[PDB]
Write a protein that holds these residues in place. Structure first.
Motif, mmCIF file in Angstrom:
data_model
loop_
_atom_site.group_PDB
_atom_site.id
_atom_site.type_symbol
_atom_site.label_atom_id
_atom_site.label_comp_id
_atom_site.label_asym_id
_atom_site.label_seq_id
_atom_site.Cartn_x
_atom_site.Cartn_y
_atom_site.Cartn_z
ATOM 1 N N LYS A 337 16.264 49.520 42.114
ATOM 2 C CA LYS A 337 15.159 50.456 42.208
ATOM 3 C C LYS A 337 15.499 51.574 43.193
ATOM 4 O O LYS A 337 16.381 51.450 44.044
ATOM 5 N N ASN A 338 14.778 52.686 43.061
ATOM 6 C CA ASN A 338 14.954 53.834 43.954
ATOM 7 C C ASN A 338 13.605 54.549 44.028
ATOM 8 O O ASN A 338 13.196 55.231 43.087
ATOM 9 N N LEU A 339 12.927 54.385 45.160
ATOM 10 C CA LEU A 339 11.580 54.912 45.298
ATOM 11 C C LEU A 339 11.582 56.430 45.203
ATOM 12 O O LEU A 339 12.557 57.100 45.555
ATOM 13 N N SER A 343 13.860 56.223 48.953
ATOM 14 C CA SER A 343 14.422 54.949 49.380
ATOM 15 C C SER A 343 15.246 54.324 48.263
ATOM 16 O O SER A 343 14.884 54.399 47.085
ATOM 17 N N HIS A 344 16.359 53.708 48.645
ATOM 18 C CA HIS A 344 17.281 53.074 47.718
ATOM 19 C C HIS A 344 17.157 51.561 47.822
ATOM 20 O O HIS A 344 17.240 50.988 48.910
ATOM 21 N N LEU A 345 16.961 50.915 46.677
ATOM 22 C CA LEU A 345 16.729 49.473 46.613
ATOM 23 C C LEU A 345 17.900 48.831 45.882
ATOM 24 O O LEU A 345 17.923 48.803 44.647
ATOM 25 N N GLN A 434 24.017 50.194 52.433
ATOM 26 C CA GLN A 434 23.443 51.448 51.972
ATOM 27 C C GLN A 434 23.847 51.781 50.545
ATOM 28 O O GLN A 434 23.247 52.674 49.939
#
Ligand SMILES: Nc1ncnc2c1ncn2[C@@H]1O[C@H](COP(=O)(O)OP(=O)(O)OP(O)(O)=S)[C@@H](O)[C@H]1O
Ligand SMILES: Nc1ncnc2c1ncn2[C@@H]1O[C@H](COP(=O)(O)OP(=O)(O)O)[C@@H](O)[C@H]1O
Ligand SMILES: [Mg+2]
Ligand SMILES: [Mg+2]
Ligand SMILES: [Zn+2]
Lengths: 619, 657
Positions: A337-339, A343-345, A434
């Motif tokens: 996911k990547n908000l 933000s990187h998930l 990261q």
DNA sequence: TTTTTTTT
């Protein structure tokens, strides 16, 4: 001239013979037209790959002329093709630029080259001026670059447009008087002209160096290489280190010392291959057919198909079924996911096992490497922190790409990771966590995608994992790195006479394997899916599945994670939020294997089962 | 032989349509003609640059078509061959140029002063660009309307460098990317005027090439009239001049295909637009994409192959008034803006709201102060985060870096200390040592994020000591003795030695940092991770919702958007409050108390390092930042007690155990 | 070759 028009009409007849060519041309024309229509915000290039055998059969004379004298046959052939396209094409309401574009249609050929097929080292001057193909690896790819071909000019004070075309050795197969390459400044009448860019037409010129295959490279000999002038669509169809077979017109250039200005005249003419079509040679990207997709769908119907696929992996290796399943999930990866905020998930899995020497853990990584679509193999000592992530290179000073940068969306593996230098280990930390790499050395600030999956291997701090001593004692890696990393699989040898005999028989049968074609003394050269079919399934899943969390699976995950973290019981590594993320990604991967767009509580349950099997021990 | 080719364009008709648009078009829908108004300002010499918006052209075309016209589709037309149309628009502007109004600016303009004189002596004679003083420009089509749709294939869509294709040559296009480097501005002549005494005639050579050769002779009649051969002399005053600068834009790593090196395009800027860009900043630029001709010999060497460049018509920045004012009073009236923003920070992250509050305080930054005696005390704020691994520290730093307009992210291992601060490149050209702005230089007036700061080299740690306490960067490397202002804010992320904190070890030992370093930070946060069944459940639920729904669970909280936080943060930073005497007494007593505590509290279990004046200065900075958020003109005792509470919480997190 | 930051 008359021969040229005769060849034009002959190729027109050839096209008439195989409507498939005309059908493909119409598909191109209609495709581009519909793309232009309703462009909310790619166009097929005007090029055709005519089967060489078709020409050989329809008219062997013309086919031979093409192969031997391309400079005298290909030009009229492409002329005829372009004329057929245009007449058959509607070309409705063309733009002013489109009117001046005169964008023609190119030709290309497929296979069945016979002698004309060659290799950079096997090339010979005799082949000059003859259509030929060679195979090799691309090197020293020159950058794209525009190239004037027409200089559309507007005659101010007269309301007219006076274009001029331009000739170059690369542009035209036939030799023509070189164009002065000067923009028409003033009308021949005397009216000053204006360079109407855009209306004037340009092409994309590229130069690449294809070198003989090192495998073919004879001993004590530097592999010969030849240059190819890729143009237009052909430009940017490859890159350095690409094993590829190309088709082009091997051609000569320059004065080779014949010019009067030359004094020694001990040199030879320059030669090039005006590549007409390029055929990349992976031997990659797996391929699928509707029948195969249906097979995959039916296979998903199988309940424990996850177990079957896991067993299919590392069939030679034995005993690491759980690790096989972990590798399976890793290959499936999960959802990253990547908000919207930015933000990187991380959605990728990482796998690492501390094992005794000769545990086959290195062999297991080797299997994962070869089976993987795009993998990176390296080792602790053999790797470098900059070499792994990136190294600032003097080149303007550029930044060399380390292993992590390579195969960014692919996978990576490290052998003897414990032996990796701790400085490079902290270098890894940021890459893995990261999922990106940033460098600001040598006054060069940079950031790079680094989301490649990683699967390391290592031996315990004491060679043999002492179960009595703590894993921290048995593991030289900092718990931060361990907690950073996803799944710890401690594998230990045991003298289990029954098990020892089991693996002994396994390896004995393995060595007893027989190639179906070969026999005894003939040197080479329960259900389990075929490894190519396995990779096809994996790619199909990753392409067309995005499991979605289920509140029930969420409940199971939360319960498991909160208990485990609050479970006072000693753990192989400390429990952290990263453990929760690992649970989420494991459930995602399991659901992906299930080929379901919605996760299931069973997926999370299996993920938790394996996670406890690893973190706490056998479960 | 220059055969004529028919094309569906009539420059006369298009020019007539352009003139009709300019004289006619007005922003009535938005609201004399706005274009005529701009030309009137130009006549007033109010403006020396003209921007013709393609969207306005489209609106005019829509109006004409609704009326019913043989529309020349100018808005589309400009895209195919932009430069010729720019010349046509300039000529139309001259034709429709209004006369001067109010007072003209030719109080001492040599052109206006002598041009008429030259005419009186005479009583196109001279190039039109010589008199022209207005820089024509074109605004890119707004993609929001995309009324072209089928026609709008990707016109507005910014394209990576490699996305650019020779077919686009001669066409207006848009590109998004970072500016790798920017050249220093230099002058260039549109027209060159030579003066020869023998004629007394001032010829006007017009140059559009990269280079030119001098006339060195008089075709002027007066020398010809007497048969004399003129020795022409360059006249800089007479010759027209324009500013020029060059910038290079490079592909974004995201734009870059995997395994492909980023490509960079050279950009030429002229006139007012010069210096608008800033190196290393993401920007979307629109301009004519044109080939670059060669010198004669290098041309013959290259042949049909041509260099290419971009001339920027317009520039758009993804980041850096009354509208802002109302937008901010909205939140101000909403109230509790401080806590609301703190929660709004890192909506993904759960808990640690105090950490978010401190990060907001850092974002606003403390007041920079300079004394009449010449003292200057850093108003920037520096905070260190020292915690067990995997507690979202890195995520928080990345979120902040994205939040701050000028933020830059960095990791200790990946960044060299020299590169972090500044690098001396021996051989950019001619092997001449040159200072290179380091990550901190990039972070100037911005926030720099350093991860694994513990893993960072100790020597480079000492290197950053100078910059963090003292803004400027002084460099005495070989061949370069220089100083850089280098004003920026620092946020560092690190973990306790051995990875995670040891209760047995003293807080300082777990910190494992130089005392000088420690003190230089305004704040250090010892966030620690302990298993808490209820807290673990809450965090897991939050994270699971975030996964299930990309938006974080609302939890009866509303989060302000990034642009809104940046706007309000700028406004608050504009305040610069001044504190009061009662606050002085309060803070003095608190500082004395803290120093006495440290003077007795050397015990390893409770030893966090001796209090220092830098601690008092940091407290004052935090109070001033709090006032900035509250927007008060003066710092309040409430802010002081709040800052004291923040520090006490930071220290007590361990003591809570 | 010699001197030289800078990274490896
Ligand atoms: N309170 C939290 N809210 C949301 N996500 C969290 C929280 N705590 C931990 N995480 C997640 O757990 C992981 C924590 O590790 P990272 O964020 O990658 O780095 P970090 O170790 O937390 O910070 P370092 O030590 O400076 S690298 C990330 O995936 C976070 O998204
Ligand atoms: N459980 C097992 N099943 C199959 N082969 C094994 C097993 N354990 C060890 N081997 C064999 O031992 C050989 C050496 O293993 P290696 O990869 O060197 O282990 P390590 O990486 O632990 O040194 C491998 O070729 C592998 O085939
Ligand atoms: Mg091994
Ligand atoms: Mg982190
Ligand atoms: Zn003269």
């Amino acid at each position: 001239d008359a021969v040229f028009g005769d060849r034009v009409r002959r190729f027109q007849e050839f096209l008439d013979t195989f409507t498939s060519y005309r059908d493909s041309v119409r598909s191109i024309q209609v495709y581009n037209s519909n793309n232009a229509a309703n462009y909310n915000d790619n166009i097929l290039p005007h090029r055709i790959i005519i089967s060489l055998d078709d020409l050989r059969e329809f008219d062997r004379s013309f086919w031979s002329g093409i192969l031997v004298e391309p400079a005298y046959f290909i030009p009229p052939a492409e002329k005829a093709l372009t004329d057929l396209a245009d007449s058959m094409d509607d070309v409705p309401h063309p733009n002013a630029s489109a009117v001046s574009s005169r964008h023609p249609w190119k030709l290309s050929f497929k296979g069945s080259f016979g002698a004309h097929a060659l290799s950079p080292r096997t090339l010979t001057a005799q082949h000059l001026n003859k259509l030929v193909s060679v195979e090799g690896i691309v090197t020293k790819t020159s950058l794209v670059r525009p190239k004037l071909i027409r200089s559309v000019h507007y005659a101010a004070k007269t309301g007219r447009f006076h274009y001029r075309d331009y000739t170059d050795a690369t542009t035209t197969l036939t030799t023509r008087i070189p164009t002065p390459a000067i923009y028409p400044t003033e009308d021949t009448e005397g009216n000053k002209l204006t360079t109407e860019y855009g209306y004037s037409t340009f092409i994309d010129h590229q130069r690449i160096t294809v070198q003989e295959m090192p495998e073919m490279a004879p001993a004590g000999q530097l592999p010969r290489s030849i240059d190819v002038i890729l143009d237009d669509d052909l430009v940017d169809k490859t890159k350095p280190g690409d094993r590829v077979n190309v088709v082009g017109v091997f051609k000569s250039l320059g004065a080779g010392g014949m010019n009067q200005s030359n004094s020694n005249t001990l040199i030879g003419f320059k030669t090039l291959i005006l590549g007409n079509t390029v055929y990349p040679l992976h031997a990659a990207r797996q391929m699928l057919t509707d029948f195969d997709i249906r097979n995959i769908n039916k296979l998903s119907k199988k309940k424990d198909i996850f177990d079957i696929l896991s067993q299919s992996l590392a069939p030679s290796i034995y005993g690491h079924d759980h690790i096989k399943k972990a590798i399976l999930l890793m290959l499936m990866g999960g959802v990253e996911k990547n908000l919207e905020n930015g933000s990187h998930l991380r959605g990728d899995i990482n796998i690492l096992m501390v094992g005794d020497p000769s545990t086959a853990k290195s062999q297991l990584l080797r299997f994962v490497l070869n089976t993987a679509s795009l993998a990176i193999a390296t080792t602790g000592r053999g790797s470098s922190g900059v070499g792994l992530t990136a190294a600032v290179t003097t080149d303007e000073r550029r930044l060399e790409a380390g292993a992590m940068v390579l195969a960014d969306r692919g996978v990576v593996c490290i052998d003897e990771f414990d032996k990796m230098t701790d400085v490079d280990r902290v270098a890894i930390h940021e890459v893995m966590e990261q999922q990106t790499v940033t460098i600001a050395k040598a006054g060069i600030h940079t950031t790079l995608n680094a989301r490649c999956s990683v699967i390391a291997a290592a031996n315990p701090v004491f060679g043999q994992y002492d179960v009595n001593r703590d894993p921290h004692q048995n593991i030289a890696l900092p718990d931060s790195l361990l907690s950073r990393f996803d799944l710890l699989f401690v594998v230990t040898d045991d003298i289990n006479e029954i098990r020892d005999r089991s693996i002994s028989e396994h390896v004995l049968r393995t060595h007893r394997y027989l190639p179906p074609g070969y026999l005894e003394g003939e040197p080479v050269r329960p259900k389990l899916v075929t490894i190519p079919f396995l990779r096809k399934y994996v790619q199909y899943a990753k392409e067309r599945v995005i499991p979605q969390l289920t509140q029930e699976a969420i409940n199971v995950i939360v319960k498991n994670y909160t208990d485990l973290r609050n479970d006072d019981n000693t753990k192989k590594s400390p429990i952290t939020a990263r453990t929760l993320e690992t649970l989420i990604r494991l459930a995602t991967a399991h659901a992906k294997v299930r080929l379901s767009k919605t996760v299931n509580k069973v997926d999370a349950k299996v993920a938790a089962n394996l996670l406890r099997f690893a973190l706490l021990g056998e479960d | 032989a220059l055969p004529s080719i028919q094309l569906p364009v009539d420059y006369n008709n298009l020019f007539n349509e352009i003139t009709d648009f300019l004289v006619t078009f007005k922003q009535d829908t938005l609201s004399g003609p706005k274009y005529m108004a701009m030309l009137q300002k130009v006549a007033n010499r109010e403006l020396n640059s003209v921007i013709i918006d393609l969207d306005d052209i489209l609106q005019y075309q829509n109006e004409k078509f609704l009326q019913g016209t043989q529309a020349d589709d100018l808005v589309s037309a400009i895209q195919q061959n932009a430069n010729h149309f720019t010349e046509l628009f300039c000529r139309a502007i001259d034709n429709n140029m209004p006369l001067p109004t109010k007072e003209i600016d030719y109080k001492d303009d040599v052109l206006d002063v002598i041009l008429n004189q030259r005419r009186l002596r005479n009583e196109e004679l001279f190039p039109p660009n010589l008199t022209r003083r207005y820089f024509l420009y074109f605004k890119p089509l707004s993609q929001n309307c995309a009324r072209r749709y089928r026609k709008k294939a990707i016109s507005s869509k910014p394209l990576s460098v490699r996305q650019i294709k020779g077919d686009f040559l001669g066409q207006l296009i848009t590109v998004r990317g970072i500016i790798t480097r920017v050249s220093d501005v230099k002058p260039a002549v549109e027209v060159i005027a030579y003066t020869c005494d023998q004629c007394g005639y001032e010829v006007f050579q017009e140059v559009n090439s990269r280079t030119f050769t001098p006339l060195s002779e008089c075709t002027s009649e007066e020398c010809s009239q007497n048969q004399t051969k003129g020795q022409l002399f360059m006249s800089t005053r007479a010759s027209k001049f324009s500013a020029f600068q060059e910038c290079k834009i490079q592909e974004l790593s995201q734009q870059v295909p995997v395994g492909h090196i980023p490509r960079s395009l050279n950009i030429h800027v002229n006139g007012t637009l010069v210096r608008s860009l800033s190196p290393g900043d993401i920007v979307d630029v629109t301009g004519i994409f044109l080939p670059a001709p060669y010198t004669g010999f290098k041309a013959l060497k290259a042949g049909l192959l041509t260099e290419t460049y971009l001339e920027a018509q317009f520039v758009r920045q993804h980041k850096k008034t009354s509208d802002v004012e109302e937008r901010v009073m909205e939140l101000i009236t909403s109230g509790d803006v401080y806590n609301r923003l703190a929660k709004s920070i890192a909506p993904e992250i759960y808990g640690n709201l105090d950490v978010k509050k401190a990060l907001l305080l850092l974002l606003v930054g403390g007041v920079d102060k300079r004394v009449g005696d010449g003292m200057k005390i850093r108003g920037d704020i520096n905070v260190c985060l020292m915690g067990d691994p995997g507690v979202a520290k890195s995520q928080l730093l990345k979120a902040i870096c994205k939040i701050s307009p000028r933020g830059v992210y960095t990791t200790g291992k990946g960044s060299s200390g020299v590169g972090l601060t500044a690098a001396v490149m021996k051989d950019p050209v001619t092997d001449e040592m040159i200072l290179e702005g380091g990550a901190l230089v990039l972070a100037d007036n911005g926030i720099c994020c350093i991860d694994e700061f513990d893993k960072m080299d100790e020597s480079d740690r000492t290197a950053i000591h100078e910059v963090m306490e003292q803004q400027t960067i002084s460099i005495s490397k070989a061949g370069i003795n220089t100083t850089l202002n280098a004003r920026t804010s620092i946020l560092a992320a690190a973990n306790p030695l051995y990875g995670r904190y040891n209760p047995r070890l003293s807080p300082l030992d777990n910190i494992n940092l130089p005392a000088a370093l420690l003190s230089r930070f305004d704040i250090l946060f010892l966030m620690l991770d302990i298993p808490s069944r209820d807290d673990d459940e809450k965090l897991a639920e939050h994270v699971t919702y975030v996964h299930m729904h990309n938006k974080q669970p609302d939890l009866d909280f509303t989060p302000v958007e990034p642009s809104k936080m940046r706007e309000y943060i700028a406004y608050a930073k504009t305040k610069r409050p001044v504190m009061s005497e009662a606050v002085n007494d309060y803070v003095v007593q608190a500082y004395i108390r803290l120093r006495q505590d440290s003077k007795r509290e050397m015990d390893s279990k409770f030893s966090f390092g001796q209090a220092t004046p830098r601690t008092l200065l940091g407290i004052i900075r935090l109070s001033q930042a709090l006032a900035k958020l509250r927007l008060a003109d003066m710092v309040d005792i409430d802010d002081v007690e709040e800052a004291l509470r923040l520090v006490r919480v930071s220290k007590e997190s361990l003591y809570q155990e």
